[PDB]
Design a protein around this ligand. Structure first.
Ligand SMILES: Cn1c(=O)ccc2ccccc21
Length: 112
């Protein structure tokens, strides 16, 4: 299994997942200046920019490495925000619409 096709697949997958975040609320780290209590109960912040950096730093060498960080985006947002917020519901939607994107991408990786 070769690194380059896998990183190509991950790049395409990341773009596809990011397309689902239509408000771009997960594009960059949660602004810790704007939400000072964020780190009280969120242990590992994650966002799509950080994911792209990790990808390009060769930190993702299997599909789980990648999916785990995607799942952190979602779970951190569910954890931090009240259910009655757009932010919470955006994480739900990202989880749901991301599901098929990740499943298809993993099937591709398994054929490598
Ligand atoms: C995703 N998210 C949160 O989960 C919480 C606060 C916040 C503030 C600005 C941008 C995104 C944010």
């Amino acid at each position: 299994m070769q690194l380059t096709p896998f990183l190509i697949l991950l790049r395409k997958t990341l773009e596809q997942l990011q397309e689902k975040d239509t408000g771009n609320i997960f594009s960059e780290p949660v602004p810790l200046s704007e939400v000072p209590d964020y780190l009280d109960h969120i242990k590992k912040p994650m966002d799509f920019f950080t994911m792209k950096q990790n990808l390009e730093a060769y930190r993702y060498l299997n599909f789980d490495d990648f999916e785990e960080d995607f799942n952190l985006i979602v779970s951190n947002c569910l954890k931090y925000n009240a259910k009655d917020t757009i932010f919470y519901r955006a994480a739900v939607r990202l989880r749901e619409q991301g599901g098929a994107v990740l499943r298809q991408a993993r099937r591709q990786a398994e054929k490598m």
